[PDB]
Amino acid sequence: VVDPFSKKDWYDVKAPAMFNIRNIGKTLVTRTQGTKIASDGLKGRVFEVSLADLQNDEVAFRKFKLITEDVQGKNCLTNFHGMDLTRDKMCSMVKKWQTMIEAHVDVKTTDGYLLRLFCVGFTKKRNNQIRKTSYAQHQQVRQIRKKMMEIMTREVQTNDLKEVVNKLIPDSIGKDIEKACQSIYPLHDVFVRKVKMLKKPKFELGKLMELHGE
Amino acid sequence: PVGTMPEGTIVCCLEEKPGDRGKLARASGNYATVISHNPETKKTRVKLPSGSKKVISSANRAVVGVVAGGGRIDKPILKAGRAYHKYKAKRNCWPRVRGVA
């Protein structure tokens, strides 16, 4: 009898100001009826959105998360929650006869945003190489992996979250641990595989409204 | 109070109602695990030593950890005389004559 799609109304979702496209899409939520208010029914919704429908030229194989932390009327304002690669890219780059190396480190920013970083990388077959296996030795891996997690430990612990995720769209971290490892063994598919969030710092409402600023 | 400790902690001697000065999971070796807080309508559930889960108040004060004296029922009484001494200190209940007899 009753239609539940009459008692719902459509909101619309905004991105942080560091992105070019600011308007993600349109979620929805039911209307307020007594206790069930229409403001906690949509906080904490994760919007698993890629870069290419969020930037003008940037690649599609990298997606982000963007939890809603606030509603300002019709708008549904978001903050960064994590990123990962799409799985088609994540296992297009895992081929045979190369050694895959990976690392992880738990770093907080200077802003109170304890993160967990995942980075991967692949040994590179050379351009005049004739032998089939471009394998690394285990002590070479243990010092590549020591050098990987050292660099992104710095480039999170430098400054606040806003410059760390902005580092992420560019995804330089992977280029920097590319350039700083190829005097140990040469690498070529060197990405930050997944970023996971662990802490929230008390939810100061002014910090969010700065991130949706100009 | 159990509203502040996080989920999956191990608790003994918890109050079954706020102020009761400690009633649930008290005997030697037992413990209770808290699960699934509810911050509005402040009331949490726990896991009792019988496996029966029970929703209680969120301000039930409770001591963290398991009771000392665990493993007590692993050793056999092993003879009738040490069961005499076991129940001499408790009650008058030990020699239980079968009702058929």
Partner: protein, 91 residues
């Protein structure tokens, strides 16, 4: 000398009580009568008082532990997870 060949501590029960039951006691009984190294003073003086109550011959410090043995394996699993939950997320 090698006085007895299987029974050890439960030769005090003699020919009574069963074979599995005497075998079942002689792990618990060698455990409740042992002197353990005290974690607070280093000496092998943790001697069992009443059940669940463990006490030092010197430094005189009473630890409430397991019934037959000093560290119940269920107690160490809890303590290893309690200090995990204290530092993780900081309540």
């Amino acid at each position: 000398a090698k006085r007895t060949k299987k029974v050890g501590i439960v030769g005090k029960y003699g020919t009574r009580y069963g074979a599995s039951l005497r075998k079942m006691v002689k792990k618990i009984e060698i455990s409740q009568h042992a002197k353990y190294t005290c974690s607070f003073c280093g000496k092998t003086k943790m001697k069992r008082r009443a059940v669940g109550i463990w006490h030092c011959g010197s430094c005189m410090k009473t630890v409430a532990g397991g019934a037959w043995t000093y560290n119940t394996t269920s107690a160490v699993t809890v303590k290893s997870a309690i200090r995990r939950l204290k530092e993780l997320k900081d309540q």
